[PDB]
Amino acid sequence: SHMRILFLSYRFNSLSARLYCELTEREHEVSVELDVHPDLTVEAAELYKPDLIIAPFLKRKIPQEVWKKYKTLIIHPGPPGDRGPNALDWAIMKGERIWGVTLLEASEEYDAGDVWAYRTFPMRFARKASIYANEVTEGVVECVLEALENFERGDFKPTPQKEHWWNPKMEQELRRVDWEQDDTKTVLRKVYASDAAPGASSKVLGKEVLLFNAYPEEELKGKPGEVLALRDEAVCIGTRDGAVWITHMRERKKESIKLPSARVLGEFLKGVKEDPIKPWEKVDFKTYREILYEEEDGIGFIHFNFYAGAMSTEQCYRLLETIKYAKKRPVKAIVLLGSEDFFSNGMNLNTIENAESPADESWRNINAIDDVCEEILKTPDKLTVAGMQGNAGAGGVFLALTCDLVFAREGVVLNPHYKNIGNLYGSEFWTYTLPKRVGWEKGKEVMENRMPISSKKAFEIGLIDGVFGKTPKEFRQRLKERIKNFINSKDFYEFIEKKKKERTSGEWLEEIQKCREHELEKMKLNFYGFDTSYHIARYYFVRAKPHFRTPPYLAIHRRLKFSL
């Protein structure tokens, strides 16, 4: 059973990429056609002639002549019988305690098809994007693998829907945050239901904005809608009964992009006081903590919750400060944990796109990331560990590889390449870390591959040191257990005595410095050379510019020497 499967996807988003990994790593073939026009979707089915069509992420209705000719399965982010385009938004706005995902056949009426598989799960009070990236994606993977088994046996009959309900597209009026009428929990619900799209509309300091990435505040209080403090470019705003932090906003203009709240609001904030909290401080009330540092059992853990996994120049320097602090503590190991949803995705393209000179900000950002990487590498007397709870890509993958040990949760998706951002050369000392892990030949193959790999595949090829745990929490618990065991063994003290010798030698230090210099000269060419392929790719990505065809690297049915 080696099937030829066609994905229909609005964008090749995280769910599409997770399912791509699960299917191709089982030796099925997956071709992708992006959702551009029904005529293109029809042409792609006729060109590729799939065994099976899966639609992980649909915008347009599938043309009748496709799904009447090829078995076509649709992913719906709600339990059986739920119908409509904003299933998750409604489930969060309504406060459902149980939700689910359904794999169902295409049909004439919207979301009416017979059910092939479904999974249910308890709801978290959390951002829509986090539900989609964790509970929904894990459930969808189980549905799809189950349906491939059913499909190959050949006598499967799906289950028609009995009871069902329809929720229309959710309107902004329902999402809009009113600082006077809404208590903190209501603000949270509205932002969570709208994050990472379309955002919850609001007014702040006179500006019509969309709100993203909210956190409750318990100490600071004031008048509803008053800005009470600034902290790492997040703003804290009074609610009816309290206060809420908003880390990111987007103005409601055509050209505008999602940015840290301080950069959107700008001069309007003049006079607000920064309310700093160091990551290593203990607080016993709820508040916004971008970076958290905690010690347990001789291990120092650094959580860094950078929105979208994107690390701006300033977030890099804040992370560096915390690594430096940790390296002065009496810990045996330092563990970089990122956030539950992302380890890191590299440079912050939005803050780069927003800068007066994108090229100068790119140069600032890559040097900031490399300063973090350098500090990690030059840690002679402690174990360094990257714990990837969530996806990673571009410079974020190579940040992890500077750690002595790299572990990832099961189901993490990796993009260890730059082919989506204008073929950047990359830095982060990859010319040192990558061949030490896979060899030069395979390392070059890894960075030429534009398609994603799973953390299981990354472990099998030697790119990372282990993969375990189904959820972020389970992964953190097994990670701590495994590190705790190592640092309490004789093997750890032998290892540190060797590392102390290697990482203080002049030879090793000149080696890593030469790798940084050579990488940065290439990135300098990328950022400033006459070829501006990097800037062009960044513009299309940050601005979400639409596609007018499916590139051949996605569409196998549209490659030059394609036949049969």
Short mmCIF file of N, CA and C in Angstrom, two decimals, residues 97 106 251-252 278 333 383 399 549 551:
data_model
loop_
_atom_site.label_atom_id
_atom_site.label_comp_id
_atom_site.label_asym_id
_atom_site.label_seq_id
_atom_site.Cartn_x
_atom_site.Cartn_y
_atom_site.Cartn_z
N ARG A 97 -16.78 22.61 26.92
CA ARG A 97 -15.79 21.88 27.68
C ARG A 97 -15.21 20.70 26.90
N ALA A 106 -16.23 14.82 1.26
CA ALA A 106 -16.78 15.98 0.56
C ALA A 106 -18.22 15.70 0.14
N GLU A 251 -3.01 47.41 13.30
CA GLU A 251 -3.94 48.47 12.93
C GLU A 251 -4.87 47.97 11.84
N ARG A 252 -6.06 48.56 11.77
CA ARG A 252 -7.06 48.11 10.81
C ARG A 252 -6.94 48.90 9.51
N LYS A 278 12.43 40.69 36.05
CA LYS A 278 13.49 39.81 35.58
C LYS A 278 12.97 38.37 35.51
N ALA A 333 23.09 21.97 34.51
CA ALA A 333 22.58 21.94 33.15
C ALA A 333 21.71 23.16 32.94
N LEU A 383 26.11 21.38 31.18
CA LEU A 383 25.41 20.78 30.05
C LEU A 383 24.39 21.77 29.51
N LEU A 399 19.60 27.26 16.08
CA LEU A 399 19.76 27.64 17.48
C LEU A 399 19.76 26.41 18.39
N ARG A 549 -0.67 30.19 -8.51
CA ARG A 549 -0.40 28.84 -8.98
C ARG A 549 0.29 28.11 -7.84
N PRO A 551 3.62 26.10 -6.75
CA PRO A 551 4.99 25.88 -7.20
C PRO A 551 5.26 24.40 -7.42
#
